[PDB]
Amino acid sequence: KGPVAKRDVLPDPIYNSKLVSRLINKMMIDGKKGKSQTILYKSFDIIKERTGNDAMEVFEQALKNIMPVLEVKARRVGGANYQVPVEVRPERRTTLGLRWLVNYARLRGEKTMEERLANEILDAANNTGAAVKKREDTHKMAEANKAFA
Amino acid sequence: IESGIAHIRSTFNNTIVTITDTHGNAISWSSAGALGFRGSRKSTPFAAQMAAETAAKGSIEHGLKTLEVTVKGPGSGREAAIRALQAAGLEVTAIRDVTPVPHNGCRPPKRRRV
RNA sequence: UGAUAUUGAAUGUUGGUACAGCUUGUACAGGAUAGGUAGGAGCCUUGGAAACCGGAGCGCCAGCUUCGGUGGAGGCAUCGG
RNA sequence: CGAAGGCGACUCUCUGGUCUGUAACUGACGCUGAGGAGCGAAAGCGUGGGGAGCGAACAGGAUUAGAUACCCUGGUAGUCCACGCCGUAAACGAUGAGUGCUAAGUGUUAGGGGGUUUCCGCCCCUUAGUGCUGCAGCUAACGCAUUAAGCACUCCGCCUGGGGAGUACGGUCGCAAGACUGAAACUCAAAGGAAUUGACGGGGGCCCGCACAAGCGGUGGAGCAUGUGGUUUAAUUCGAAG
RNA sequence: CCCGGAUAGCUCAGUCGGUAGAGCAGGGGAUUGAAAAUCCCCGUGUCCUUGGUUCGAUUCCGAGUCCGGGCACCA
């Protein structure tokens, strides 16, 4: 065994980033890039419009209200159900934020995910949001289980 | 007031910390169940980290600065009060490991698997 | 078992009043920390103000309160919000 | 250190044996020993004393399908003392007591003798228990090896396949509990001894696979296709069954 | 005659005028080769009703049920 990393593709046509294409690899139902890309670029045009800002500065500032600090791993001794505080790697802040974005985005419920994802980011930019408490409750799981390390 | 000593008892369950007078008169005390470590979390070094600070807050209420720490019992909190109470701005002067050592005493109870 | 006290002599002690002293009074808005009624545009300082420091204490922990020590002639009220 | 069971605070009183040093003495006075005698942890017994911990029985709370158990907080007798009795245990070195003899090496407890040295010390010789690794030989193998299970000898006990059984009966002994002496009818062809290769372990150590964790997507709901079940019929052809 | 209990589903607390608080339960979360017991999260409440003081006031008086502890009338 040992550590094994995987590869990733750099560019973006619009919002010329690296992490945005990782979100393009998210919500890829059944092997559809452009069908998710059609959802994506129509959303950020609203995000640029509905809030009069550049959508990049809206995007990662919303991520900072999603990117957690502590995971929780476990420990079974009998039936005690112990937990372990885990420092979140700078790898995992990029990854687990996307899961807590897109899962709660498609689960809210509006017309299209052009509208679900756009208002979700404003619910994390202005951090009053349903998926933001998913970050917060893990800290509540971390604050109780802090005593172990 | 100005001076006092600090008793700490760190058993296998509890980390009981009292701040008393030099000539044995109590001022403030707390432990893990005083904070709310309800289960068998009471023996963790994080518990004695939290419990020593709360008792030290009552010392700031009475303004005493000098301490004299006597550790009593086998556990894990004998390092934590050194880490806590020195960081609490209080003067830790002497550290004793006063466990009450019996010579022969009375006979202990049975081993747990007999 | 208690009152009476044959039965006083003190010492403390905690309640009660007879007394008095003497603290507390924002929901926000707000300059803020606005109980109400009456008088009311005034008071106050070398018989010490603005400001600084210390103490007691309170705080709906913001700040208020009072006292002491410095200081140097200044504050505060209606009005206004 | 005591013969064994056993005895660890301290001091005193009283008392047993042990080992060295020789040589003064005795002149074989010795060894072992059936019955007999006395000792013999812990439990238990009878009478009072004392009962802080601890703690069978029991009680309670959990645990669990059950918990008359392990855990849990209490908790009676007990343990403790004087005195009397029971006289058993893996009362073990699983090795009956004594006498001599048979390579070493090595510590360690108490001595003694010497070699330079007051020394401290080092070295060597030497009695006595005390442990370990070791030759010959003994051993069925593990092991045992100057502390023998080596080679010899004197004495005492014990065994003759396993279960039935340390039971029944008979007797002694005891305050009782039960101890000691101690069978038989019956029944199996074997029960055990060390050793080896294995397989297993809610035993350990290393280490691996989508095994697990970290993810994605489904099966179990819904219709429908299909496959065996069962059931159903004239027969629902037979086979495959973690 | 006095004193005791009127809230969240329930058991219960709780201010000197400005508001919803624990425990158990409900709902889910993770945890765990499963299981409770734990560990978090929101939940849901005209603080009994009616008037009054007042700027409105569980808050707090003006007006009353029903359960327990008693002194004591009862021809």
Q: Which amino acid is at B8?
A: I
- The Å distance, CA of A64 to C1' of C27, is 37
Residue B43 has a CB neighbour count (10 Å cut-off) of: 19
Residue whose structure tokens are 């303004």:
B63
> CA of B33 and C1' of D99: distance in angstroms?
77
CA distance B110 to B51: 32
Nearest to A97 by CA among A23, A10, A11: A23
Experimental approach: cryo-EM
CA-wise closest residue to A133 among A66, A87, A84:
A66
- Mutation test of the interface with chain A: which of B41, B42, B76, B83, choosing the one with the most A Cβ atoms within 10 A? B41
Enter the tokens of residue A108: 């809210």
Which of A47, A61, A123 lies closest to A39, judged by CA?
A47
Residue in the block written with tokens 């079974």: A76
Residue A75 near chain B (CB below 8 Å): no
Which DSSP state fits B3?
B
Backbone angles phi, psi at B15, to 5 degrees: -115, 90
Residue A25 CA, chain-centre distance (Å), reads 12
Beta bridge partners of B7: B18, B70
In 3D space, the residue among B5, B10, B3 whose CA is nearest the CA of residue B76 turns out to be B10
In chain B, what is the straight-line distance between the N-terminal and C-terminal CA atoms, in Å?
53
DSSP B40: G
Quickly count helices (H) and strands (E) in chain A.
6, 2
Cβ(A77)–Cβ(A42) below 8 Å: no
Residue with tokens 């701040």: B19
> What is the C-alpha to C-alpha distance for residues B50 and B77, in angstroms, rounded to an integer?
11
Entry field: residues in chain A: 149
Asked if the Cβ of residue A29 lies within 7 A of any atom of strand D, the reply is yes
A-contacting residues in B 37-76 (Cβ below 8 Å): 37, 41, 44, 46-47
Reading the block at residue A129, the tokens are 């949001």
Task: Please list, in sequence order, all residues whose beta carbon lies within 8 angstroms of the beta carbon of residue A72, skipping any fewer than 6 positions away.
Answer: A83, A84, A85, A86, A138, A141, A142, A145
Q: Rg (Cα) of chain B, in Å, rounded?
A: 15
Q: Which residues of B59-79 are buried (b: 16+ CB within 10 A; e: fewer)?
A: beeeebeebbbbbbbebebbe
Measure Cα distances from B26 to B19, B22, B72 in Å. Answer: 6, 9, 17
For residue A122, give the nearest of A108, A143, A139, A141 by alpha carbon: A108
Measured distance CA(B98)–CA(B52) in Å, rounded: 18
Report phi then psi at A125, rounded to 5.
-65, -60
Q: State how far the Cα of B21 lies from the Cα of A142, in Å rounded to an integer.
A: 38
Alpha-carbon dihedral angle through residues A136, A138, A142, A143, given to the nearest 10 degrees: 30
CA distance B63 to B73: 28
Contacts of A147 in chain B (CB under 8 A): 37, 41, 44, 46-47
Sequence-distant (≥ 6) Cβ neighbours of residue A5 within 8 angstroms: none
Nearest one of B77, B33, B30 to B54, comparing CA atoms = B30
Query: Phi/psi at A35 (nearest 5 deg)?
Result: -65, -35
CA-nearest of B1, B4, B46 to B29 is: B4
Q: How many CB pairs under 8 A join A and B?
A: 9
Annotated resolution, angstroms: 4.5
Nearest Cα residue to B22 out of B66, B71, B87: B66
Q: Which residue of A has its CA nearest to B48?
A: A147
User: Crossing angle, helix A34-50 and helix A113-125, to 10 degrees?
Assistant: 50
Q: Is the CB of B107 under 7 A from strand D?
A: yes
> Of the candidates B92, B13, B84, which has an alpha carbon nearest to the alpha carbon of residue B55?
B84
The CA distance from B59 to B92, in Å, is 13
